[PDB]
From a paper:
Consider, for example, the Ras proteins, which are prototypical members of a superfamily of membrane-associated small G-proteins that control an extraordinary range of cellular processes. Ras proteins are capable of producing a diversity of signaling outputs by binding to effector proteins, most importantly to the Raf family of kinases, which activate the MAP kinase pathway. Ras proteins cycle between an active GTP-bound state that transduces signals by binding to effector proteins, and an inactive GDP-bound state that cannot bind to effectors. The switch between the GDP- and GTP-bound states is accompanied by correlated conformational changes distributed throughout the structure of Ras. Two segments of Ras, referred to as Switch I and Switch II, undergo substantial rearrangements when GTP is replaced by GDP, as illustrated schematically in Figure 1 (for a comprehensive review, see Vetter and Wittinghofer, 2001).
Leu 120 is in the guanine-binding loop, with the sidechain in van der Waals contact with the edge of the nucleotide base. Mutations at the base of Switch I (H27G), in helix α5 (Y157A), and in distal regions of the guanine binding loops (L120A), increase the rate of intrinsic nucleotide release. We found that the transition between the R and T states can be triggered by one of the hotspot mutations identified in our study, L120A. The two conformational states have been denoted ‘R’ (assumed to be competent for GTP hydrolysis, although this has not been established definitively) and ‘T’ (assumed to be inactive in terms of GTP hydrolysis). Crystal structure of the L120A mutant shows a rotation of Tyr 71, whereby the sidechain is exposed. Additionally, the interface between helix α3 and Switch II undergoes a conformational change. Helix α3 and the C-terminal helix of Switch II shift downwards in the transition from the R state to the T state, leading to a rotation of Tyr 71 from a buried to an exposed conformation.
Numbering used by the authors: 1 to 166
């Protein structure tokens, strides 16, 4: 069956792991354990196609991010995650998009911009600001909450749909 290799990137603490774990394992991780490099694999049906998702959950903390570039190299599509209550994480997206361009040696890489923690109280990134960033890159913007599961399937399956357009 078809395999889609997805990679989740973004700053430390934005919820990359919680998003991935909510998708794959259907629960919310409340604690914060920084990731080095973890992978998940699950068979799903997306738009009628039975396929395998192979998801690489990467480090956002610089301390844990050593060989991240090498892990990312085989990714077919990337979630670029920030948190809507973390302006710096949004400002950092540019760096992740550049890193993706370097590891894929392409300026045409399937990507989705994800504004996570949309359940949070202290929003500092307004939807329109993120829509504009995504528009600049030619990619969709989706908001998610790993806590409530809002948007989580939509985000990952949208990334698959973006891969399928390349
Ligand atoms: N309220 C809320 N908290 C969230 C959400 N997603 C993650 N968190 C919380 O934010 C913290 C960090 O989440 P985590 O998934 O570990 O972040 P990460 O991006 O994987 N961090 P790292 O890059 O160090 O591996 C955790 O306490 C987690 O519960 C969300 O959608 N809403
Ligand atoms: Ca929990
Ligand atoms: Ca993590
Ligand atoms: Mg390169
Ligand atoms: Mg503002
Ligand atoms: Mg398109
Ligand atoms: Na930055």
């Amino acid at each position: 069956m078809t395999e889609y290799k997805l990679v989740v990137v973004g700053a430390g603490g934005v919820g990359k792991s919680a998003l991935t774990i909510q998708l794959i394992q259907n629960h919310f991780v409340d604690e914060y354990d920084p990731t080095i490099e973890d992978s998940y694999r699950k068979q799903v049906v997306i738009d009628g196609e039975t396929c395998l998702l192979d998801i690489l959950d990467t480090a956002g903390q610089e301390e844990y991010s050593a060989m991240r570039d090498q892990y990312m190299r085989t990714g077919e599509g990337f979630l670029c995650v920030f948190a809507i209550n973390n302006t710096k994480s949004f400002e950092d997206i540019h760096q992740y998009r550049e890193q993706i361009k370097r590891v894929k040696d392409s300026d045409d890489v399937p990507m989705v911009l994800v504004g996570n923690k949309c359940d949070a109280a202290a929003r500092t990134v307004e939807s329109r600001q993120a829509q504009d960033l995504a528009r600049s890159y030619g990619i969709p913007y989706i908001e998610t909450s790993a806590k409530t599961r809002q948007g989580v399937e939509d985000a990952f399956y949208t990334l698959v749909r973006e891969i399928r357009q390349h």
